[PDB]
UniProtKB/Swiss-Prot annotation, chain A:
Function comment: Attaches the virion to the cell membrane by interacting with host receptor, initiating the infection. The major receptor is host ACE2. When S2/S2' has been cleaved, binding to the receptor triggers direct fusion at the cell membrane. When S2/S2' has not been cleaved, binding to the receptor results in internalization of the virus by endocytosis using host TFRC and GRM2 and leading to fusion of the virion membrane with the host endosomal membrane. Alternatively, may use NRP1/NRP2 and integrin as entry receptors.
Glycosylation-annotated residues: N41
Species name: Severe acute respiratory syndrome coronavirus 2
Name the record gives this protein: Spike protein S1
Impact when changing N41Q: Increased resistance to neutralizing antibodies
Record gene name: S
Subunit and interaction comment: Binds to host ACE2. RBD also interacts with the N-linked glycan on 'Asn-90' of ACE2. Cleavage of S generates a polybasic C-terminal sequence on S1 that binds to host Neuropilin-1 (NRP1) and Neuropilin-2 (NRP2) receptors. Interacts with host integrin alpha-5/beta-1 (ITGA5:ITGB1) and with ACE2 in complex with integrin alpha-5/beta-1 (ITGA5:ITGB1). May interact via cytoplasmic c-terminus with M protein. May interact (via N-terminus) with host bilirubin and biliverdin, thereby preventing antibody binding to the SARS-CoV-2 spike NTD via an allosteric mechanism.
Length: 50, 50
């Protein structure tokens, strides 16, 4: 997630893993999905749990 | 003029395979020589005018 002037530039990438210990070693590109033109000051974030 | 991309040249059928999110394209010298049609998914090589 970024804080560009007007856009947010949501990036994402889904890759299968097998180590299951920590962040697996390897290089994978992050393809953009949507660029929402949301111009607002963002200085605090919090995720949601189910 | 493809969404602000203004220039001159000939549009020829290219054999490149652009990514599902990439429309523009530049060479090593930062010169636009390939772009897809934003209306119909089809790559178009931009060769300079004679």
């Amino acid at each position: 997630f970024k804080n560009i002037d007007g856009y947010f530039k949501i990036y994402s990438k889904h890759t299968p893993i097998n180590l299951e210990r920590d962040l697996p070693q390897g290089f994978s590109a992050l393809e953009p999905l949507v660029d929402l033109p949301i111009g607002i000051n963002i200085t605090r974030f919090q995720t949601l749990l189910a | 003029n493809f969404n602000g991309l203004t220039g001159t040249g000939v549009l020829t059928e290219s054999n490149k395979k652009f990514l599902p999110f990439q429309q523009f394209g530049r060479d090593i010298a930062d010169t636009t020589d390939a772009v897809r049609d934003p209306q119909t998914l089809e790559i178009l090589d931009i060769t300079p005018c004679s």
